[PDB]
Design a protein around this ligand. Structure first.
Ligand SMILES: [Zn+2]
Length: 263
């Protein structure tokens, strides 16, 4: 079965999932000089006031916070997107140490972790239909930059001890995902994929340029989770990130001017 280790990790996934070598794979390195500022890119509209979190779970590859996506409670619109995308879950990727953990990189810089807020296009009626479509998902990616403690992450950190091994889950209600957003919503965007098998090319990626903070103590609690199930040999859940993939025939667009000397 696929994983993140030496024998079953990302460099092996193509054997069972040939789309791993596809045209539109994620994550990518965001080369900020090469990216194209598009002055027509519209602002994002993050409407999370009515978000309803339900459960937190260790799925053996990350932990997910699941939301009630039965109505337009928490939605993402705008930017490169047509219509409305409903928030279904968020999860993180992180490292064995503070110097790595993100999936996207920025000018080859790795952050300590990356948050993925996963939304599906209401055009398609449910997640399972949406994931089969090229415009099915929108993932909002947010970097976690190691530094001062982040109160917005603390309710998450404080429940992780309850989900240490694969298959465990816990109640997780009234969590406000607005607390995980940076002040600026300027972004890069490109068409890409799920970053785990089956690696489907169904995602409009929206990566925020401004990171959020996380302390070393907070991210260390992520590293206390385990990939394995209870009773199997201990395999700490660390380095659950896929390496960057080639852009190929894509161009990353920026909603903003990152380098003033280029404009
Ligand atoms: Zn992810």
């Amino acid at each position: 079965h696929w994983g993140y280790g030496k024998h079953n990790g990302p460099e092996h996934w193509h054997k069972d999932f040939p789309i791993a070598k596809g045209e539109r794979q994620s994550p990518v390195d965001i080369d900020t000089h090469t990216a194209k500022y598009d002055p027509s890119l519209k602002p994002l509209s993050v409407s999370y006031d009515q978000a309803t979190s339900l459960r937190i779970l260790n799925n053996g590859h990350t932990f997910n916070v699941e939301f009630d996506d039965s109505q337009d409670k928490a939605v993402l619109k705008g930017g490169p997107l047509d219509g409305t995308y409903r928030l279904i879950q968020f999860h993180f990727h992180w490292g064995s140490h503070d110097g790595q953990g993100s999936e996207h990189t920025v000018d080859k810089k790795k952050y300590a972790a990356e948050l993925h807020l996963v939304h599906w296009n209401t055009k398609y009626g449910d997640f399972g239909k949406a994931v089969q479509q090229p415009d099915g998902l929108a993932v909002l990616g947010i970097f976690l930059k190691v530094g001062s403690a982040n109160p917005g992450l603390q309710k998450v950190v404080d429940v992780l001890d309850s989900i240490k091994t694969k298959g465990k889950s816990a109640d997780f209600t009234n969590f406000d995902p607005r607390g995980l957003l940076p002040e600026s919503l300027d972004y890069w965007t490109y068409p890409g994929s799920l970053t785990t098998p089956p690696l489907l090319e169904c995602v409009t990626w929206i990566v925020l340029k401004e990171p959020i903070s996380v302390s070393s103590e907070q991210v260390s609690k992520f590293r206390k989770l385990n990939f394995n199930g209870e009773g199997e040999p201990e395999e700490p859940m660390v380095d659950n990130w896929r390496p960057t993939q080639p852009l190929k025939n894509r161009q990353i667009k920026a909603s903003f001017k990152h380098h003033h000397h280029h404009h």
